[PDB]
Design a protein around this nucleic acid. Structure first.
Ligand SMILES: [Mg+2]
Ligand SMILES: [Mg+2]
Ligand SMILES: [Mg+2]
Ligand SMILES: [Mg+2]
Ligand SMILES: [Mg+2]
Ligand SMILES: [Mg+2]
Ligand SMILES: [Mg+2]
Ligand SMILES: [Mg+2]
Ligand SMILES: [Mg+2]
Ligand SMILES: [Mg+2]
Ligand SMILES: [Mg+2]
Ligand SMILES: [Mg+2]
Ligand SMILES: [Mg+2]
Ligand SMILES: [Mg+2]
Ligand SMILES: [Mg+2]
Ligand SMILES: [Mg+2]
Ligand SMILES: [Mg+2]
Ligand SMILES: [Mg+2]
Ligand SMILES: [Mg+2]
Ligand SMILES: [Mg+2]
Ligand SMILES: [Mg+2]
Ligand SMILES: [Mg+2]
Ligand SMILES: [Mg+2]
Ligand SMILES: [Mg+2]
Ligand SMILES: [Mg+2]
Ligand SMILES: [Mg+2]
Ligand SMILES: [Mg+2]
Ligand SMILES: [Mg+2]
Ligand SMILES: [Mg+2]
Ligand SMILES: [Mg+2]
Ligand SMILES: [Mg+2]
Ligand SMILES: [Mg+2]
Ligand SMILES: [Mg+2]
Ligand SMILES: [Mg+2]
Ligand SMILES: [Mg+2]
Lengths: 124, 233, 87, 66, 34, 154
RNA sequence: AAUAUGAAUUAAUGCGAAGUUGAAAUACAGUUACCGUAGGGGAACCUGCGGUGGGCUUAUAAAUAUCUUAAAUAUUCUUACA
RNA sequence: AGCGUUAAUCAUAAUGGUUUAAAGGAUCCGUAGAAUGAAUUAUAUAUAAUUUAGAGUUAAUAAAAUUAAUUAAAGAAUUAUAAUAGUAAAGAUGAAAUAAUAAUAAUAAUUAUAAGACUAAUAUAUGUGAAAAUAUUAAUUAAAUAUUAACUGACAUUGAGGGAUUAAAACUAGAGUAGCGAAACGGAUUCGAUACCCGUGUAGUUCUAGUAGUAAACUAUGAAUACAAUUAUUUAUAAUAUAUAUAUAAAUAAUAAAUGAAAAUGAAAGUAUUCCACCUGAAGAGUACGUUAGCAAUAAUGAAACUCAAAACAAUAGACG
């Protein structure tokens, strides 16, 4: 904190980002292939059965991706696109399968927030 | 204790209130306080003379002001260690008042222990009203004591009848002694006269003392007997 | 001599106000009797009056007869008597 | 006659004349001027019809205060 | 560090010491001749 | 020197805090100039040469015989239970000494932060050294002197 | 030569799950706790040696006290007296 | 005529801190510093000539006998052996036992030898030392305080790297080994007792020569300079007319102000200036890998992934012991 010390490398610490999604490799989505599809127990104390999956991305690295919505159509080989969200209650899963695209179909009978899932406009 | 802003800024705080309309009516004191402002300047002021002696506080004796040789015959050619230290605390700390008379007083009561036994009233009568010519010792409002002697000594010193202080002191002492002897003779002869003309004193001083001792002795005796009994058991 | 100034205390007060009362007469008599019965065998008539005196003492109750307020002056005068510097 | 040499609030330094007999002695010309100033303000509030309140918790002070 | 916080550090240090004690023969084997 | 100047400023601040009336300072030329500038702006009540022990009544010439014991006595100033000389922060510190051109000084005067100096305030005084002569920053601008921005009093 | 990836087997560590064994720490935590270090023990830990307080400043009595006009005088006094 | 979302960028607190929350290096010494650093005048931040206030040098006069290293002494006790006389228990513990205890004659007592290792009071670690440290005595050599006189003339401060010293434990040699005492074995305790208690008691503790360079190496507070309001204690210095009341310093204890998250700091944690060290959420981690050094234990250097919205301090009021 002396003037000399400041000159030879000292100052306020600066943080930009540590990247929330490192395996995604600085891009919005990556295509992947599901390996297995699980049902995870959440962290204490909120409880459910979370429909996560394991996905090998095109870049190579493997990732535990969450699957949102009520109903999920995902096998052991389905084409699936991954984005950089985070399932907060499940530890060690830092990704979401984006749901309109790929073999993952749009969530059925969705009325609210349709673009957040795959749901098309019902068209009367 | 921090210097309080809020004890002296009273009228300002009320003036603000009056301006606002928090106060509808002005206080009785408001105009008076405006007329006669507080000090509000709580400084440490420096002092340059000792008032009792008349010594100078602020000044420093220089090397050029001391040309002649010192004790042990060395000429001062440099400032010493104390002449470089910044003596500001002396300007601010209040002066110890010293008098030549205090030493004389101390001497007198050493020489005359039994003058202490003469009781002294310290409750002052009007100090401005008095007007003592110390040509003589016996002043009217003042009694005869060591103080009067000392005042006489000081007067002699001032007038330069005795240039030396000690001689003046001795002279004052000798003046005092004669007066004291006269006082002593007065009382005894007055007592004799009283005895002659059939005056009757119920309790003499020595008799009083004996009586006083007697009560104490009686108190002691009962206690002492109890203590002896306790010791036995 | 070496003066000893205390720090600022919460409350100047004697820790325990022992009163220091005199020992009981009946107990003393009993001790004396015990001492006598040490000597002179079990119950010889050298301690004939002592036993009677003990009995007289311990007739109504086992003991015959059945506080120091120094806190008030210390408590009162602590704040004065301190050499605590000004506020 | 001020308090004592060891019981000195140095805030009051300007008022004191010197020390003597192990006692700070209050400058009395200063005392006089402050007294006059105080006396004048006392007179003023009495003239205006203000409520003057004399506060004196020490032992002997009561009668003179009343 | 409070004492409570220090106790975690102490525990860690103990574990490390234990690990070192365990892996003495293994460490020796690794060190000599390579 | 600039360290000395900083020390005297700190001493002034200390004296303002406790409300002393009359305060000693070291007897140098720069220091004297600074004191004179303060006096003229109106922060000091008095300024007078003197001994280490006190201010001098009569004139005493300063020589190698005196110089070590010589001192600059300075009267401080108070009004309505508030000291006049509140602060004495210096700007050109010994390690990062700053020297402005006339334009920069003008900008500072007109409410522009320059070289990380907060621009000068309503009742403030930024002193400026220019060819070993301390001035007000406004005075320096008027005369057009590129100078060292010394210090700041408020 | 340096760098990168792979390796049977293996170690540390994290997260979840609250199972088992003790009960080491927090109060004098029921052997004061911790630092360094050494040896021992299923596991927390135990023991030696010096250090530290972030534990004991948490500190609070062997007791005795005096004489001058007690009043026709002090006690009363409302800008008087002098 | 986009709206969401993801991936990114910029802004969003250093107009910061490190006694107790992350953070003062164990300590000093001292090199570089493109770090900082007195006075006056004159030259066109520098040169030059003058100054002595910082920093030194040498005397003189007072004091002080402390800290190193080395050499030479003293002492209470302890254990062991032997003798004397003497009699059945002794020693231990919460209470008990086991044991080189005791009917081979002990323990206690009195003597007499030897051996190591420790240093009761004074003692406050006051003080002294850079810090580790340092109180039985003496000697030697080294270093040390204050004030005067004279001299030097800014020669200073701090100090990356570097260097030296650095408790206890540990290690390598060679002596030494009374007492204590990791480990080990045995006796208790306990449901169990790899413990707390007791008994044998080896390394170790001791010295000589080294290695190593860490500790709650702590005032958990880097060094230096200038400055600021009081009181009480001692200590030393000077004057006073040797024992008085005074002027100085120095330390210690209470505070004012000020600072502070508060606890509290109090001539510093205040006001300022200079220089160095160090910190930037918690876990993972002072770990791994690598390198250097070491006889070794290890010491220094010192990452990342993975995972959380935690984690920490001062103080408050309870409950609890
Ligand atoms: Mg929704
Ligand atoms: Mg919709
Ligand atoms: Mg910390
Ligand atoms: Mg190779
Ligand atoms: Mg493998
Ligand atoms: Mg159990
Ligand atoms: Mg324990
Ligand atoms: Mg206990
Ligand atoms: Mg426990
Ligand atoms: Mg315990
Ligand atoms: Mg236990
Ligand atoms: Mg063990
Ligand atoms: Mg221990
Ligand atoms: Mg505790
Ligand atoms: Mg405590
Ligand atoms: Mg910024
Ligand atoms: Mg802080
Ligand atoms: Mg330190
Ligand atoms: Mg540290
Ligand atoms: Mg030091
Ligand atoms: Mg001793
Ligand atoms: Mg240095
Ligand atoms: Mg030690
Ligand atoms: Mg050793
Ligand atoms: Mg050995
Ligand atoms: Mg044992
Ligand atoms: Mg070495
Ligand atoms: Mg270590
Ligand atoms: Mg360390
Ligand atoms: Mg230590
Ligand atoms: Mg305060
Ligand atoms: Mg601050
Ligand atoms: Mg304090
Ligand atoms: Mg590496
Ligand atoms: Mg290491």
């Amino acid at each position: 904190a002396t003037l000399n010390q400041i000159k030879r490398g000292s100052g306020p610490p600066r943080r930009k980002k540590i990247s929330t999604a490192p395996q995604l490799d600085q891009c919005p989505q990556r295509k992947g292939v599901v390996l297995r599809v699980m049902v995870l127990k959440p962290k204490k104390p909120n409880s459910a059965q979370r429909k996560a999956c394991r996905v090998r991305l095109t870049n190579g690295n493997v990732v535990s991706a969450y699957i949102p919505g009520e109903g999920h159509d995902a096998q052991e080989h389905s084409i699936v696109y991954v984005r950089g969200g985070r399932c907060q209650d499940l530890p060690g899963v830092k990704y979401h399968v984006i749901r309109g695209a790929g073999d993952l179909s749009g969530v059925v009978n969705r009325i609210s927030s349709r673009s957040k899932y795959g749901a098309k406009k019902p068209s009367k | 204790m921090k210097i309080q802003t809020n004890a002296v800024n009273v009228l300002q705080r009320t003036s603000a209130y009056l301006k606002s309309g928090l106060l509808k009516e002005t206080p009785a004191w408001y105009n008076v306080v405006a007329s006669i402002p507080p000090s509000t300047k709580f400084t440490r002021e420096p002092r340059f003379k000792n008032p009792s002696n008349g010594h100078i506080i602020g000044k420093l004796v220089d090397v050029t002001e001391q040309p002649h040789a010192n004790n042990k015959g060395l000429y001062k050619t440099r400032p010493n260690s104390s002449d470089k230290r910044v003596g500001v605390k002396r300007l601010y700390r209040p002066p110890k008042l010293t008098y030549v008379e205090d030493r004389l007083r101390s001497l007198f009561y050493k020489q005359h222990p039994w003058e202490l036994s003469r009781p002294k009233i310290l409750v002052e009568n009007e100090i401005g009203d008095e007007n003592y010519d110390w040509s003589h010792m016996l002043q009217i409002g003042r009694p005869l004591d060591g103080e009067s002697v000392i005042q006489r000594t000081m007067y002699l010193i001032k007038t330069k009848q005795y240039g030396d202080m000690v001689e003046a002191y001795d002279h004052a002492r000798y003046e005092f002694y004669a007066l004291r002897m006269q006082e002593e003779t007065e009382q005894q002869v007055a007592l004799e006269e009283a005895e002659m003309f059939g005056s009757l004193f119920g309790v003499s001083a020595i008799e009083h003392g004996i009586q006083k001792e007697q009560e104490v002795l009686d108190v002691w005796e009962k206690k002492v007997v109890e203590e002896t009994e306790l010791m036995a058991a | 001599p070496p003066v000893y100034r205390l720090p600022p205390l919460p409350r100047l007060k004697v820790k325990k106000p022992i009163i220091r009362q005199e020992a009981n007469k009946c107990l003393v008599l009993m001790s004396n009797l015990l001492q006598c019965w040490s000597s002179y065998g079990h119950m010889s008539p050298k301690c004939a009056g002592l036993v009677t005196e003990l009995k007289s003492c311990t007739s109504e109750s086992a003991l015959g007869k059945r506080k120091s307020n120094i806190n008030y002056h210390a408590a009162r005068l602590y704040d004065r008597i301190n050499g605590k510097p000004h506020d | 006659l001020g308090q004592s040499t060891s019981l000195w609030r140095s805030s009051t330094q300007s008022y004191i004349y010197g020390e003597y007999k192990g006692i700070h002695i209050i400058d009395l010309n200063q005392t006089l001027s402050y007294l006059k100033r105080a006396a004048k303000v006392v007179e003023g509030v009495s003239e205006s019809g203000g409520i003057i309140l004399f506060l004196g918790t020490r032992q002997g002070q009561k009668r003179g205060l009343e | 560090d409070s004492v409570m916080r220090k106790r975690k550090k102490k525990m860690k240090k103990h574990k490390l010491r234990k690990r070192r004690k365990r892996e003495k023969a293994e460490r020796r084997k690794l060190s000599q001749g390579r | 020197s600039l360290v000395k100047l900083a020390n005297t400023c700190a001493h002034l601040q200390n004296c303002s805090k406790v409300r002393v009336a009359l305060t000693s300072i070291p007897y140098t030329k720069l220091q004297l100039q600074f004191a004179y500038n303060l006096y003229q702006q109106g922060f000091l009540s008095s300024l007078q040469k003197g001994s280490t022990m006190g201010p001098d009544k009569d004139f005493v010439e300063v020589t190698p015989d005196n110089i070590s014991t010589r001192r600059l006595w300075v009267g401080l100033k108070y009004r309505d239970n508030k000291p006049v000389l509140s602060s004495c922060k210096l700007i050109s510190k010994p390690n990062s000494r700053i020297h402005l051109p006339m334009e920069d000084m003008k900008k500072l005067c007109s409410g522009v932060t320059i070289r990380n100096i907060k621009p000068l305030q309503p009742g403030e005084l930024i002193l400026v050294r220019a060819h070993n002569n301390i001035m007000d920053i406004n005075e320096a601008i008027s005369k057009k002197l590129d100078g060292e921005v010394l210090c700041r009093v408020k």
